[PDB]
DNA sequence: CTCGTGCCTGGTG
RNA sequence: CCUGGUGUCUUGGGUG
DNA sequence: CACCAGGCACGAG
């Protein structure tokens, strides 16, 4: 069980430091060098981790006994800080500094890239090896009206008419399926592939016209 | 002359009390509550 | 020269070895200003057509960096940018052609320089 | 349409806007406009 | 090759002697326009310390 | 718009050399396409309403990055009148 | 502005009171106004700009 | 009318104007 | 309100916010991401 | 980089496509597959980039349970899970598989 | 027909 | 057939 | 306003 790993005062401190924002990754990259290449000499460098959190921006937690290992460690290291604004961790704070951390068929989510950024779409179905999902959402089409697409210059959301398209001239897949300019339109609804890390599902608060709409 | 007119009677400044603003009053005098700070949500016009 | 060197070290173990990434800076090529358009052919630059079109008066220089690599178990031209050139200089297009081809230029020989032309 | 007055080999040509500007003889990218089909008056004064 | 001539024409341009975003506690007026009105005020110009 | 006219401009947006032009007069013609006909919106160039004149040349050429670079010359006689200053 | 109405006149710097006094529009051709050659003492102002 | 010579714009009445056409300056048969 | 804070515009189609409306933004992001601490894991100095 | 689903190893593509994972090639066999089978095993998304410099006394390598591997990067959260026929075959062969994705 | 790579654009400090 | 809109901050030289 | 990561279109096997 994860409750038999609590530590005790038997465990290493650990010290908090600040560092670059944006080279915080350098920074534990550039302690593992030097850990790496001082194991086996005769100054060996005593310290035992050192990780960062995304959520916790500028700072580095390294595991060590006393300081001095750690002022070895952020020695001539360029994105640290030449000031000693270093901090003790508590031994109740190092569960909360290793914390890891939904969606689901049917919820409504919003898309944070591409040219229909900013619009509720819902779930339809995840692929198998779990890293896009299937959105159904309005189109944002012309109809090829000046053809011979970016977010700023995108057309006016409307569902997709399987008859204004042919009198301004389409593939007809299924009843209400139809393949049109390469993409998937089922009851005027175009279902696109989306990443998983191009979506939002946590605090989305749906506008005036979401409502009015859906 | 420029001003419309208005049932409100004109009168002039006799007195300028100074202090400090109450939360009490500042929600009371307030006519919406701002949380986001985006300034453009869809980028389609029509501020949210 | 004040800073000609630049030296590197990464100690790598995985039988340990140091590898130095040495770049030492050379000589200093200078060249008479030349204007490139955006089509990519490149032509002989006048202050007049710097002047008419809102140009820079520059001349590219160029560097030689020389790589060498250090290992211990135990050559082209790069272009660094381009720097404004005075009028009626050393490095400037009115010094030579005598005066018959100032005139052609639309430049006037009363014009002393000694000035740059930005934008 | 409108006339043209190149600034090196002095062409008169005339472009439609939807040309780029150059000469159709020399090349040169430098041109001017031509003078107006009104006539110019002067006081004398 | 961007940085260099960006700042030569900024310094040369703006007359500010220094990096762009160190605008403070900087010398400026070191480029001005050169004044073209007559003969004699670039002569006077040219010269001026 | 402007308040001031747009017949003294050509086909190709530029004035010819030749016309005298005075306060508030349209001399180089641009519109910008508005983001989502009537779909632009005015950015012409007048003259100074303290300035008249008779247009003396007109360049036309590229820049740096390729899109077109105008330029008006307008030339004008100033006659000493009462009120000028003159110095020894 | 037609004539006999008071407009007050002034010139910077306004150190006295005196600096500002109302006088007549009288109508007159050209771009200069045209003042007395009595009031110059007290507006401390010349004809050189 | 804003005259072509001076830089000053002057009221004028209108049997004192000439227009111009296709064929010289034709006046208020125009 | 926007009339203490005014928006101009630069080059016609593209306007410039007011220093103060870019202040504001900040303030109300350190508000939102003050928010986002009390709920999850906190070691104290991240919320100091 | 990618980072393992069973370890949580930090490694780019081509370690985990050449000699496969320093701590799971013994079970999951990555070293003899194709781009698939790596890809369905190492995440290219992972959070909380740890540098394991003891594999014993160090509490950090206790808590993230990689206290019996060898030193590297780490990932403390991987997103995405490993496939139900691979969870099968690791179960088979007598190891069992824990969700490093919280 | 499919993968590697240079170029353009939006997010963020 | 009325109504009507082009700007904030600096740098160098001049005027009284 | 300047740096970094993602999407798009071109070239080659
Ligand atoms: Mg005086
Ligand atoms: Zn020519
Ligand atoms: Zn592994």
């Given at each position: 069980p994860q409750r038999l790993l609590i530590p005790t005062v038997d465990d290493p401190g650990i010290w908090g430091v600040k560092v670059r924002l944006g080279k915080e990754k350098d920074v534990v990259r550039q302690i593992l060098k030097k850990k790496l290449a001082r194991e086996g000499t005769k100054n060996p460098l005593e310290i035992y981790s050192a990780f960062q959190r995304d959520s916790f921006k500028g700072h580095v937690y390294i595991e060590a006994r006393k300081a001095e290992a750690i002022n070895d460690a952020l020695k001539g290291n360029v994105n640290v800080f030449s000031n000693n604004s270093k901090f003790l961790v508590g031994i109740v704070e190092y569960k909360d500094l290793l914390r890891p951390v939904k969606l689901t068929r049917g919820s409504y989510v919003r898309v944070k890239?591409?040219?229909?950024?900013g619009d509720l779409a819902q779930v339809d179905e995840v692929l198998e090896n779990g890293l896009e999902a299937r959105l159904k959402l309005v189109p944002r089409l012309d109809?090829?009206?000046?053809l011979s697409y970016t977010s700023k210059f995108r057309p006016a959301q409307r569902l997709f008419s399987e008859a204004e398209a042919r009198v301004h001239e389409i593939r007809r897949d299924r009843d209400g399926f139809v393949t049109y300019g390469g993409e998937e339109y089922y009851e005027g609804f175009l279902y696109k592939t989306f990443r998983l890390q191009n979506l939002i599902v946590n605090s989305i608060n749906p506008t005036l016209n979401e409502l009015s709409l859906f | 002359s420029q001003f419309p007119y208005s049932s409100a009677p004109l009168r002039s400044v006799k007195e300028v009390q100074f202090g400090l603003l109450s939360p009490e009053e500042i929600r009371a005098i307030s006519v919406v509550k701002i949380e986001y700070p985006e300034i453009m949500d869809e980028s389609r016009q029509r501020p949210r | 020269w004040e800073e000609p060197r630049l030296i590197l070290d990464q100690p790598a173990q995985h039988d340990n070895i140091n590898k130095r990434y040495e770049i030492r800076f050379g000589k200093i090529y200078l060249s008479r200003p030349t204007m490139t358009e955006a089509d990519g052919t490149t032509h002989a630059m006048f202050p007049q057509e710097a002047r008419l079109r809102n140009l820079t008066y520059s001349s590219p220089v160029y560097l030689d960096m020389e790589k060498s690599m250090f290992t211990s178990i135990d050559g082209n031209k790069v272009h660094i940018g381009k720097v404004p050139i005075m009028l009626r200089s050393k490095f400037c297009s009115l010094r030579t052609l005598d005066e018959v081809d100032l005139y052609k230029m639309k430049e006037?020989?009363?014009?002393?320089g000694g000035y740059f032309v930005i934008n | 349409g409108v006339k043209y007055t190149c600034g090196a080999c002095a062409h008169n040509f005339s472009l439609n806007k939807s040309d780029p500007v150059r000469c159709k003889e020399c090349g040169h990218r430098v041109i001017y406009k031509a003078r107006t089909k009104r006539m110019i008056q002067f006081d004398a004064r | 090759s961007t940085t260099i001539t960006s700042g030569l024409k900024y310094s040369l341009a703006?007359?500010?002697?220094?990096?762009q975003k160190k605008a403070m506690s900087s010398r400026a007026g070191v480029s001005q326009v050169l004044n073209r009105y007559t003969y004699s005020s670039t002569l006077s110009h040219l010269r001026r310390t | 718009l402007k308040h001031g006219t747009y017949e003294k401009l050509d086909e190709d947006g530029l004035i010819a050399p030749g016309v005298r032009v005075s306060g508030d007069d349209i001399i180089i013609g641009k519109t910008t396409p508005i983001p989502p006909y009537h779909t632009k919106r005015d950015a012409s160039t007048p003259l100074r309403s303290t300035e008249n004149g008779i247009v003396d040349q007109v360049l036309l050429t590229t820049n740096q990055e390729g899109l077109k670079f105008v330029k008006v010359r307008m030339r004008t006689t100033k006659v000493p009148q009462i009120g000028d200053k003159f110095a020894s | 502005l037609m004539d006999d109405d008071p407009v007050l006149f002034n010139r910077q710097?306004?150190?006295?009171?005196?600096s500002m006094m109302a006088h007549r529009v009288k109508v007159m051709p050209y771009s200069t106004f045209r003042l007395n050659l009595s009031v110059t003492s007290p507006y401390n102002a010349d004809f050189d700009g | 009318v804003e005259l072509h010579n001076p830089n000053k714009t002057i009221p004028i009445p209108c049997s004192f104007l000439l227009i111009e056409s296709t064929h010289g300056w034709v006046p208020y048969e125009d | 309100p926007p009339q203490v804070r005014p928006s101009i515009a630069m080059d016609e189609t593209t306007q410039g916010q007011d220093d103060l409306t870019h202040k504001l933004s900040d303030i109300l992001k350190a508000n939102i991401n003050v928010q986002k601490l009390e709920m999850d894991g906190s070691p104290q100095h991240i919320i100091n | 980089e990618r980072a393992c689903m069973l370890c949580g190893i930090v490694l780019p593509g081509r370690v985990f496509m050449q000699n496969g994972c320093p701590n799971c090639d013994s079970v999951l066999?990555?070293?003899?597959?194709?781009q698939a089978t790596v890809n369905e095993c190492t995440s290219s998304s992972f959070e909380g980039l740890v540098a394991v410099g003891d594999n014993e006394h160090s509490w950090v390598a206790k808590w993230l349970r990689v206290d019996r591997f060898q030193p590297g990067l780490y990932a403390v959260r991987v997103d995405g899970r490993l496939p139900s026929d691979i969870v099968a075959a690791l179960e088979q062969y007598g190891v069992y598989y824990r969700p490093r994705d919280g």
């Open positions: 890239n591409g040219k229909f950024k109809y090829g009206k000046d | - | 006037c020989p009363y014009d002393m | - | 703006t007359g500010n002697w220094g990096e | - | 710097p306004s150190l006295h009171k005196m | - | - | 066999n990555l070293r003899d597959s194709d």
